[PDB]
């Protein structure tokens, strides 16, 4: 028997995240994302009641946003944790479930403030010259450049959702693996390309 | 406005607290010890 | 005879969500999915009065939205669990029944408010600049720039169903299938590569 | 001869529905289904005058909806159904009908209230506006475009028909089959793959 | 308004009311025997 | 307004009252060793 | 209006009872035989 | 205006003090001995 016992799929164990990432939050989140890490505190638990330790372990994470429910939806990518003398680097696949739901739980910050001020003070300068463009018998120019050039340069910004210090979130394995060491994984490898027939 | 409503009800959020990564290692790693016990 | 007993189709046993995920209720919802996982708590009814015991084992799920039903549409991905000292995981087809109807009844939340308000409000100074642009002889640029950088913002946002923390729903195998160990699978996978003609 | 008598087609027999689903009412209903399943509580009548007992056998079934007649046309899935210490599954086709007609009885659902009475409001914005804007020598904006965002989201919505709990339906076999045991069933492809020539 | 009437006859639908499929499955179960006797 | 009907029957919901789900698992534990018996 | 005639002559259809399928065999299973007799 | 928030919360950024990069790499020097002491 091995010394590392199998780990079946929905196995959830806790911890605290290290380092955050801001996310995001656009319509091409899942493609220019933002790496994250966090580190074990707890004890896994399996899904019969069952435990095994694995303490101060890092996990290196791959997350973007989601502003419709502003929470970061985030993809697990290793496990690294090295016990005693032996070492654990493994490529997994889960999830970050934050407060019994799914991602992490946060706010959405914009930096359009001012640009859209001044795109807006503009605008408005057009509609009193336009409305004293008007008054005849029987400015807009520079409003309208300057609005277009505002807007185009204020079409850059996405949302941002902050996220990290130090909260509590808990981390789900979505798909079942088995653990082993890197010593076992360079003997397998050889085994296997022994040809072995 | 929102036809349906448009708050939620957990009401809870995460806090940047802007602490250092360096800390947070052991902020996790005193906790770690002190929940087991 | 097989310790484990044959699953037949239309097998239903109750039990309770663990974590949540908020469902995509848009119109491409049932690609890009959120997963949740939920935990057994009953026995598992087979269709002639039968019972067997199952409980504690971990279910991994894959759902969206459906705004129309405001119900969170399921979709089982895999079975775990680990009883004694075997191991189960298996991959399922079935889905998730709320208060004796399909799905899980859930609310419909929007994020919407102030941009729309925004919106409203940058609109209401067109029509009211245009008003005053009328009277004549015989502002409304910002109010269009930015309605429409605003309308361009909020067509981002779409509906969330929030389902989640420990409501009580029921499980239903929709395909029958047999219970195996993975020391069983693993013996079968190694004879059929055998090819013992 | 065999245990099982030859179900011949047009068979039918009386049932309960155990759990229901809501009907996506659409253009495209047959397609995007939602499964549903119900159990026997009778005894099947074959034409002539005959009977054989399955009682608490259940069936899968994969329905959709009907706006004109608001009725929710089932097809059936499987068979399911564990005889003392045998075993049935088999794939059948049928369908159900209540109170002597084809389909379920219900009635029609739908979410578009709030949503029109905003879109209802913003245009009478525009027509009030666009009343002032009429009177001259010799808000209409925010009115088209919360208009058009209204209407684009409310386009979403469908028709549901919720139908479900525990009404009184009858299921009728389309096709004539013959029920026939899992190990019976494994025994005869065993001695068709031998090609017994 | 429909030109041809635009009322049924039967004036009967199902009746959803709110019950859990765990019981519906029981209210099957005791039904079934009564009904057979 | 919506011409048919626009409400439904069954009037009840689920309730995210903001629990960890380290808790759902507890929960479940005890309930399904109590509903058994 | 249309040109030619818009009714029929039978003026005679039927009559959706709201009767109920198992019954409907049980009625065709008495009569069938006082019919031949 | 921005419909959220357009403030951060850590309000903590970095200083660009015009400090020559050959200081730099002695000012890294002297702080890692007296850390690690």
């Not at chain 1, 340069?153 to 979505?174: K, S």
């Not at chain 1, 994984?185 to 296997?192: F, P, S």
């Not at chain 2, 939620?8 to 906790?31: G, H, P, Y």
């Amino acid at each position: 028997k091995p010394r590392f016992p199998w780990i079946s799929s929905g196995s959830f164990v806790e911890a605290i995240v290290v380092e955050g990432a801001d996310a995001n939050a656009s319509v091409t989140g899942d493609k220019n994302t933002a790496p994250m890490q966090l580190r074990l505190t707890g004890k896994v638990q399996m899904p019969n009641d069952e435990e095994f330790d694995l303490t101060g372990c890092f996990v290196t994470l791959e997350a973007w946003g989601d502003v419709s429910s502003e929470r970061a939806i985030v993809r697990s990518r290793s496990i690294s944790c090295k016990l005693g003398d032996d070492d654990i680097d493994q490529k997994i696949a889960g999830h970050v479930s934050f407060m019994g739901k799914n991602g992490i739980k946060g706010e959405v910050v914009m930096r359009n403030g001012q640009i859209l001020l001044y795109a807006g003070g503009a605008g408005f300068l057009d509609g009193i010259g336009k409305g004293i463009e008007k008054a005849s018998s029987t400015v807009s120019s520079a409003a309208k450049t300057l609005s277009d050039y505002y807007i185009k340069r204020a079409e850059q910004y996405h949302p941002v959702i902050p996220i990290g210090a130090g909260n509590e979130v808990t981390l789900v394995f979505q798909d079942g693996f088995q653990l082993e060491t890197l010593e076992e994984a360079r003997a397998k490898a050889a085994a296997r390309k022994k040809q072995n027939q | 406005c929102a036809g349906v409503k448009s708050s939620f009800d957990c009401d809870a959020t995460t806090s940047d607290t802007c602490m250092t990564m360096t800390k947070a290692n052991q902020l996790a790693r005193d906790k770690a010890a002190k929940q087991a016990g």
